[PDB]
Write a protein that binds this DNA or RNA. Structure first.
Lengths: 83, 109, 76, 227, 97, 95, 95, 109, 83, 97, 227
DNA sequence: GGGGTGGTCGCTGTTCAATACATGCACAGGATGTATATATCTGACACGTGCCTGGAGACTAGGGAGTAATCCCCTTGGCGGTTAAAACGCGGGGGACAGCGCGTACGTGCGTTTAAGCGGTGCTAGAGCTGTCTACGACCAATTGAGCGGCCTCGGCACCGGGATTCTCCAGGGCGGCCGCGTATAGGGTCCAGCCC
DNA sequence: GGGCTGGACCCTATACGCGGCCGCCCTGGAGAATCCCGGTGCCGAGGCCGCTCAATTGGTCGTAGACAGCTCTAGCACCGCTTAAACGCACGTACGCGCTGTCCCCCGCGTTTTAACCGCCAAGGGGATTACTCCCTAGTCTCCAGGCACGTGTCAGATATATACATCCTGTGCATGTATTGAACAGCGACCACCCC
């Protein structure tokens, strides 16, 4: 029921693929933990605003529009999800 | 009373809905008064920008030998242009990917 | 009257072998375990020894200059 | 399959204060992407009309453009002595750009610094620089145009310094090569295996990446002569 | 004997592959569980639209890629070719994060 | 019975058919273009609102929208959007 | 006869006298604090307007101002501003 | 009949002007209508943030043995606190200077 | 009337002082021209918006309020002049 | 008799000096002339408020100071202490300019 | 100049249910910056009231507080069995933070992990670590306090991980030093020249840099014993 | 009174002592820079005064927001395979980094020049405000057709299978310079024959 | 009458070339990747049809702003003078860069494991809409008091001076290491004082 350790679900090969798309040729092994931490920070910051919008609308379901508003408030304007 | 009517878009020579634009300007709390030429001018600008983006994306789709513009082609069209990328510098495009770019020092030789 | 660390390095090169010459790094690492070796200026004394022995032509620089490169004994 | 540009009135004569009209026909629909250029003898072409209707900067209202699709027209209302020049159209609606045959008229700060005349021998290679100033270098493509005294104006290609993208005329692949230097705001076109056919005056021309934007500023021209 | 490629060429092949492709690189279900876990700290028994999870995943992947580009630029500035946590940290800190 | 939602899909499609008669589009690219149109609409609208506030004007005029365009659009985008809008406004006035 | 130009100077000064009775403040620091108050006012009001527009509400209430405060202010500053505002609103309601 | 008037600020227990905030909210094109508790809550928040800035700046001025808060003290107060620096991350303080900070590697051995 | 070469008024001592306040210990001699170029770019971007606001107000005098609006639109909100 | 400090030591004093003070580091009159020379390319015969020139100088110096901070961070990342145009350019590229 | 904080009812007895009041008197004006703490025996203090009026997170509404200036008071309405504990005031209006003498009352996710007991001979030195988790490490100061049965609770000093800022009680200058570790989110307190007087329990305590914030979370206490 | 031997002097081999050279370390003192305390003064801030306009009080209108009910959709949860991907393990190579050499780039100081800063003087362009009036945006009633939801098909493209082309890795071969060993060469030692002492 | 000298035969020290070996460079081939091309199928993109609600039109009205005119302020232009900052030059030293050496740690890849993905199915929570109502905010008029412009004084800090303390730097002297070299010391060849016969 409770979700506990899912940050490790961002696997080593997935981070490698992201780095490849970023143009990274060689990867220090500590980048995995560093990038997991950075991703956790970004997700916490965005989801906090999304849940704030969801609470304000008195809704129990976080909507893609709520996510888009959170991102736009954080300067991460996303096209393609109803914005 | 109304009669056989027209659109303000047709009067302006525009495809975009000048009437809808005026409604949104008036209901958007942008000001108390909204001049009649403001939605016309704004719809012209909106149509121009949409036309530029769509034409560049269609050229990019043609170069790929694809018939239908996709987010990849929109991303390519926007990023490959200096000032359009400047305007959309902060923007993320879903399913758009990234420009192919490898740094010279990473290549062999 | 050769220096103690001079004898140390000249015999340590023989002990290590390294047909292509031993570098200052590996001779320093292997001589560090010597009992009287000075932990603070031992490397400095080894550098003096290497430069002086090259001046005496008893050691041969395969490449480099000064302490850079690798060293092996000149034949007799 | 190149779009043929067809200026009907190859030559006209007129007096002062009267009207002159020039027409242009395309082989395919170009959707108004057409521009008009005035070239005085031994001078770089200056743009007059762009997007088939719009006056260029610093161009007086005496020049009027018209038409869309395949039929285009240029009109000069009050001719003056200074108007004696040759006028070219230019379509840029399709990737290989095409200039018109040229129409001669007789009446009875963005800077692109270009190299001086170069005398060269066949079979060698030649590199010509364009030094741009007065504007943001990376935002505009640089267009290279070859003017022979027999085949008129011809478009070689362009380089886009923002991402070093290039496009070349099929007649000029291999022959020409384009390179850019952001630090010096300078672009080089290299010609390989020089031939007597390559004896022509080459113009560098700034053109924005905007589709309706035309070749607006032109370098003074660098004459290449092959023995 | 088994054929083998030299280190660093399959890396370039992968770089070109993923700079051409556009699909999402992170496993969707693990990222879904991660988002649910992180949101569990702000409100209990939340629900998410599939489109909301997808929008989140797009934004995170784009952020990560844009960060790795700057990381690689810093690594090259250090005359290295390997990206390091000190490279990531310098990139983030110059960005202001 | 069910409620309606407005979009710019049809106008984007008509502009697509005008600029490239044979080239089509996709649902996701149409969503991206809707978002792009909405975003720039909001940007110029907000900037014109701030221009009116800074100048103590109750009304958003075509001059305010023009100045907002000159502020937000870089380089030749500004020049060409100003020309497009000026042409549209002159045509609307004449008609 | 010149007309008035309102500001927050006297209000900032009175809050200063409340928190540090004997300290002064320079004209430049008064200008900077006035600008700070204007900036934070604009930020909160803009976010509240956006919340109302997103929720289709015509009215800006204390709930929208609270949510704007929670969004724009970080960490413990958010909950302390929330407490301040809630106390002020409850006192104002009790009259 | 008309009687002794008194500010909404005192009724709310606040120093920042509830009435002026309400006037700016209604004249500022933020929405069609402006509920009564919104300017109260907003003035409370404005007062709290102004007090939080001014107390820290006064502490800095006291430490500097100066009686009057200056832009230097305001800058020091803002930058030396993470939350306030985050809130004013994009903000420049005129004559505010910069925090004294030298990297360790630049210091002599 | 005309001003031509005033970018050289940002002298090497001034750039040194700015670097010192930035915490810079040693300074390559090319930084002077690099920073002059960067400063000119930033000043052009700000002054263009300031003159745009000045034109919109139909004013022939550029005001500090116009400069503040330009900077804020560029994300560089300046406190101390916005009156 | 002539006396000299070691190079790299007066620099620390100068850094501490200017990190203490708050006044403007750029000469006001030539910065004013530079502003006029830049603006005359956008509109001729403009007037400028003294407060507008001062605000421009404040913003420029703050931008330059933050840029040099990022530049010094890049130089230290390169295991150097000298800032170089490649350091400035890297800082600008990560920052987003 | 230290502000002695004078809790008047040093001890009291009460039956179950009935209301209880505790009053404390400030030596000087502290401008409402006072907090109350409940300490069950052999356990770390938990906060009850901050800013002299505000209920802490998770404390039942049975507690209440009031007062401003120099006179402050606490109230417990519904006495329950678990309420038997020691109640301390804490002023933080002035730089040397001062706790009250403590009132013994008897009747008829943030995690700070701290090291276990320490046995140290006099003259030695010791490093008590502080493990912080569950929250953004750099935003909150870590506050160190010494508890002795003879002298009560004393504030030693705080570390601000954001900029490694320090402030120490004059009684502990040189004696204590504080350091941080952003990489492991850990704080260390050093004691130099241990003395028999130093046999005490030390608590690390989280406190945001917000002036009205108080010591909200406490470590389990490192019992340092000097032989 | 000569033959002959150990003692002792002179020449010389051995090595050790001083000689000579290079850096790490501690400290005294000269030199400059900074932190601190005191006296002067001036203009910047804190407070008082006049007033006028904008905020408060009282009351009305209506429409926007709260609340109860209903539908259905869309989110969550579960289950069973099926691989595709992730995890794991191992060999190696090439990249990170540690160390040193060097020379030149750049800091530090001194003397010179200039041009910034400050003040005072003068002038007028234009910012700001008030007053007039008209055009233009708000608002309303009626209308109708443009725009959106639902349905349907049919072709663009995604996938699969198969060659064709290209790029990468490397093992072997061709080709060249350095090393190991023997040789043509001559310097000198030694044997045989004629001659001078 | 026999050794010396001359010429010739032999012992031996030596510069140099050929064979062996390791490295440099080339290239063909194995093979794995990538691209072009065709066949298939499927689901979403584009178009049509129905309807409903919002966009249009004509008319009225009120006030926002366009325009004229006036004022007064602050922005610019100029001039003189001082002096501090900038510049030009010298000089030196430490830092950046090149080069080499080491080793370890990430890349490539084979093998095992697992859990993501997808299809299918079900439950039901709540999101959205509608109907109703009531109370909460806009709007208006009055009126008074709070806040802003202006004036004034005084004291906080800016400035000038002196002093006391701190850090830097260098010059000196001593403690490590290194190689260099003249002579102090002892062994042997050779001349002499002195014993033996």
């Amino acid at each position: 029921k409770v979700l506990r350790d899912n940050i490790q679900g961002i696997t080593k090969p997935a981070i490698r693929r992201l780095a490849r798309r970023g143009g990274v040729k060689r990867i220090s092994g500590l980048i995995y933990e560093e990038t997991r931490g950075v991703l956790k920070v970004f997700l916490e910051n965005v989801i906090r605003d999304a849940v704030t919008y969801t609470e304000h609308a008195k809704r129990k379901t976080v909507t893609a529009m709520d996510v888009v508003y959170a991102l736009k408030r954080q300067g991460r304007t996303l096209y393609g999800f109803g914005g | 009373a109304r009669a056989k009517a027209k659109t303000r878009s047709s009067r302006a020579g525009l495809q975009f809905p000048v009437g809808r634009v005026h409604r949104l300007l008036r209901k958007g709390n942008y000001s108390e008064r909204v001049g009649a030429g403001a939605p016309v001018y704004l719809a012209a600008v909106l149509e121009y920008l949409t036309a530029e983006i769509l034409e560049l994306a269609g050229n990019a789709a043609r170069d790929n030998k694809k018939t239908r513009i996709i987010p990849r082609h929109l991303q390519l069209a926007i990023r490959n242009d200096e000032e359009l990328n400047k305007l959309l510098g902060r923007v993320t495009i879903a399913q758009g990917g990234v420009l192919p770019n490898i740094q010279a020092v990473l290549l062999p030789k | 009257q050769p220096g103690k660390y001079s004898q140390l390095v000249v015999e340590t090169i023989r002990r290590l072998g390294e047909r292509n010459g031993s570098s200052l790094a590996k001779i320093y690492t292997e001589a560090k375990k010597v009992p009287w070796f000075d932990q603070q200026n031992g490397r400095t004394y080894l550098k003096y020894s290497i430069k002086a022995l090259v001046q005496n032509d008893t050691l041969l620089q395969v490449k480099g200059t000064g302490a850079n490169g690798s060293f092996k004994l000149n034949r007799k | 399959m190149d779009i043929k540009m067809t200026q009907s009135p190859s030559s006209m004569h007129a007096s002062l204060g009267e009207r002159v009209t020039i027409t242009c026909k395309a082989s395919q629909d170009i959707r108004s992407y057409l521009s008009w250029y005035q070239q005085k003898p031994w001078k770089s072409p200056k743009t007059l009309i762009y997007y088939a209707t719009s006056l260029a900067d610093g161009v007086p209202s005496r020049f009027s453009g018209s038409g869309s699709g395949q039929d285009f027209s240029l009109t000069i209302n009050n001719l003056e002595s200074d108007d004696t020049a040759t006028y070219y159209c230019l379509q840029h609606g399709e990737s290989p750009y095409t200039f018109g045959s040229g129409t001669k008229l007789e009446i009875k700060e963005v800077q692109l610094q270009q190299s001086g005349p170069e005398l060269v021998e066949p079979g060698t290679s030649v590199k010509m620089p364009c030094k741009a100033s007065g504007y943001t270098f990376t935002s505009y493509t640089i267009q290279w145009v070859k003017q022979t005294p027999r085949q008129g104006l011809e478009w070689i290609g362009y380089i886009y310094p923002y991402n070093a993208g290039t496009k070349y005329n099929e007649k000029f692949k291999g022959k020409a090569t384009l390179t850019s230097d952001k630090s010096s705001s300078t672009v080089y076109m290299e010609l390989s295996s020089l031939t007597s056919e390559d004896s022509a005056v080459y113009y560098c021309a700034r053109k924005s990446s905007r589709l309706r934007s035309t070749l607006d500023y032109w370098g003074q021209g660098t004459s290449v002569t092959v023995s | 004997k088994p054929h083998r490629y030299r280190p660093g060429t399959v890396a370039l092949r992968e770089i070109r592959r993923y700079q051409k492709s556009t699909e999402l690189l992170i496993r969707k279900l693990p990222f879904q569980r991660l988002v649910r876990e992180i949101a569990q700290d702000f409100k209990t028994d939340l629900r998410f639209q599939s489109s909301a999870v997808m929008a989140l995943q797009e934004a995170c992947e784009a952020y990560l890629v844009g960060l790795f580009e700057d990381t690689n630029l810093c690594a090259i500035h250090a005359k290295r070719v390997t990206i390091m946590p000190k490279d990531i940290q310098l990139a983030r800190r110059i960005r202001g994060e | 019975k069910r409620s309606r939602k407005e979009s710019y899909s049809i106008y984007v499609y008509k502009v697509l058919k005008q600029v490239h008669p044979d080239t089509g589009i996709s649902s996701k690219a149409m969503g991206i273009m809707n978002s792009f149109v909405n975003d720039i609409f909001e940007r110029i609208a907000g900037e014109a609102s701030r221009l009116a506030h800074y100048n103590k004007r109750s009304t958003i005029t075509s001059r305010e929208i023009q100045t907002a365009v000159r502020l937000l659009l870089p380089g030749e985008l500004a020049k060409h959007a100003v020309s497009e809008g000026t042409k549209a406004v002159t045509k609307y006035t004449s008609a």
